[PDB]
Write an enzyme that holds these catalytic residues in place. Structure first.
Site, PDB file in Angstrom:
ATOM      1  N   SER A  46       0.796  -1.224   0.000  1.00 22.31           N
ATOM      2  CA  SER A  46       0.000   0.000   0.000  1.00 22.31           C
ATOM      3  C   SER A  46       0.827   1.273   0.000  1.00 22.31           C
ATOM      4  CB  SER A  46      -0.977   0.024   1.176  1.00 22.31           C
ATOM      5  OG  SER A  46      -1.686  -1.205   1.249  1.00 22.31           O
ATOM      6  N   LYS A  49       0.094   3.524  -2.903  1.00 20.99           N
ATOM      7  CA  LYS A  49      -1.009   4.474  -2.912  1.00 20.99           C
ATOM      8  C   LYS A  49      -0.511   5.901  -3.127  1.00 20.99           C
ATOM      9  CE  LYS A  49      -4.567   1.863  -0.491  1.00 20.99           C
ATOM     10  NZ  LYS A  49      -3.804   0.580  -0.475  1.00 20.99           N
ATOM     11  N   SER A  94      -5.673   2.761   4.162  1.00 17.59           N
ATOM     12  CA  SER A  94      -5.172   1.838   3.142  1.00 17.59           C
ATOM     13  C   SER A  94      -6.316   1.052   2.504  1.00 17.59           C
ATOM     14  CB  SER A  94      -4.113   0.898   3.722  1.00 17.59           C
ATOM     15  OG  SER A  94      -3.080   1.620   4.380  1.00 17.59           O
ATOM     16  N   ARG A 226       6.181  -0.982  12.779  1.00 12.10           N
ATOM     17  CA  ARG A 226       6.641  -0.161  11.665  1.00 12.10           C
ATOM     18  C   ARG A 226       6.876   1.274  12.117  1.00 12.10           C
ATOM     19  NH1 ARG A 226       1.790  -1.490   7.692  1.00 12.10           N
ATOM     20  NH2 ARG A 226       0.806  -0.908   9.683  1.00 12.10           N
TER      21      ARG A 226
END
Ligand SMILES: O=C(O)c1ccc(-c2cccc(C(=O)O)c2)cc1
Ligand SMILES: O=C(O)c1ccc(-c2cccc(C(=O)O)c2)cc1
Ligand SMILES: [Cl-]
Ligand code: NA
Ligand code: NA
EC number: 3.5.2.6
Lengths: 241, 241
Positions: A46, A49, A94, A226
């Site tokens: 994602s 995007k 997302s 993350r």
């Protein structure tokens, strides 16, 4: 470029492996804990995007960040997806199905041309035009993510300035008196190795710190690492308090 | 327009007095604790940095949000003023000297025409070209601020969309997964009554809440109450958690 293996402590402490890449814009100097993994190309998941938004806006597939894309009525397994979205919220959550519709309307011909214009990763869109960033042929490394984001930050991508400003607004993730983070998460699960992404930059008063991280993500339980691991690196480097 | 005087508890608890005006964009509905003060026109003070920025950008006085305006070397009482600034940091730290230079470059003729085109406040620039928003004839109400801000949000001000996007970027104050605040503080100290301003909007996933507050501010010691009292109102109205 410079390797700082001390950042590995932030991965080891959470029983994880990955790479964090930082780019000091003012110094024109980069840092990472693993230069080889920093240049290893993965599915963008994602994080795609960001270029997807740019292309959709520049082509008029998306009119602006306010245009509402109605839920298609299919109940999917992430609750935030089962509602109407604009560009801002579709990126924030997302919402793959919204961006899959973008990519279908962009079409393979224009998607391939734009990624070549963007110098984005291996520029390959093998597979379905509406899923190639999740299970197709596109591959991009953390350093290629930084190089792409740097162009976006400076409005030097081969799209309108307006498109780039709208996407940078949509990337807004966190902001206070100390810093602004514009970023995009990624979760690649359809093709091994399963990894999490977080790419973007930290805007300070007098500098910008571009970052791109990915890490092995065998389960969805570590997805918060993350941001957590990236922030620990940013705090160690005195970028954020 | 609906009056909710229960918000006065948030002013009274800090032994303060003022007005908060909210506009629900989706519902086209306005709320305030004091309808009369909501329509009382005060000096905009540093909230004028919003239109001042737009005019400087549209006229080319400021090329973009990266252009550096170097410190003139005069050590002033605000530490954050004694350094180089761009449009982002100049707005964030309300660097009056930087914006006084903008106003001098714009000049009285173009400033007056632009404020007339903006329908901004009483549109009157009487006083000094580089201080009229601090001690001149311009006046704006909290509701007129919202009316101006709604135009800016929707890119309907007479200036270019790019100029409006740059200024909305510079207005970024706070952001997380729950909300985005784009706003501008103001402190009118030169002409009584001394008041603090906070005007802007709260971006939610599916709505935007415009706000414009001002409050009596006899000293700089209570300037933090501008954001504190506003947030207590936002929390009461279930706008932010
Ligand atoms: O079908 C796929 O491939 C797929 C499915 C879901 C996600 C997703 C949904 C929400 C948050 C996140 C995150 O990264 O936090 C990821 C990504 C990809
Ligand atoms: O010469 C004047 O009139 C003047 C001087 C300073 C300010 C100011 C400086 C920093 C923060 C703030 C705030 O509003 O927080 C205000 C405003 C006006
Ligand atoms: Cl922004
Ligand atoms: Na930016
Ligand atoms: Na101010």
């Amino acid at each position: 470029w410079q390797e700082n293996k001390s950042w590995n402590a932030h991965f080891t402490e959470h029983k994880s492996q990955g790479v964090v890449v930082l780019w000091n814009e003012n110094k024109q100097q980069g840092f990472t804990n693993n230069l080889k993994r920093a240049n290893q190309a993965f599915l963008p998941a994602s994080t795609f995007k960001i270029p997807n938004s740019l292309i959709a806006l520049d082509l008029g597939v998306v009119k602006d960040e306010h245009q509402v894309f109605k839920w298609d009525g299919q109940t999917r397994d992430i609750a935030t997806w089962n509602r109407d979205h604009n560009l801002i919220t579709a990126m924030k959550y997302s919402v793959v199905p919204v961006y899959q519709e973008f990519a279908r309307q962009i079409g393979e011909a224009r998607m391939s041309k734009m990624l070549h214009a963007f110098d984005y990763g291996n520029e390959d869109i093998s597979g379905n035009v509406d899923s190639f960033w999740l299970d197709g042929g596109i591959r991009i490394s953390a350093t290629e993510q930084i190089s792409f984001l740097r162009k976006l930050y400076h409005n030097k991508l081969h799209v309108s300035e307006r498109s780039q400003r709208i996407v940078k607004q949509a990337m807004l993730t966190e902001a206070n008196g100390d810093y602004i983070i514009r970023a995009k998460t990624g979760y690649s699960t359809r093709i091994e190795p399963k990894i999490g992404w977080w790419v973007g930059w930290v805007e300070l008063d007098d500098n910008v710190w571009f970052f791109a991280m990915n890490m092995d993500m065998p389960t969805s339980d570590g997805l918060g690492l993350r941001q957590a691991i990236t922030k620990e690196v940013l705090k160690q480097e005195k970028i954020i308090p």
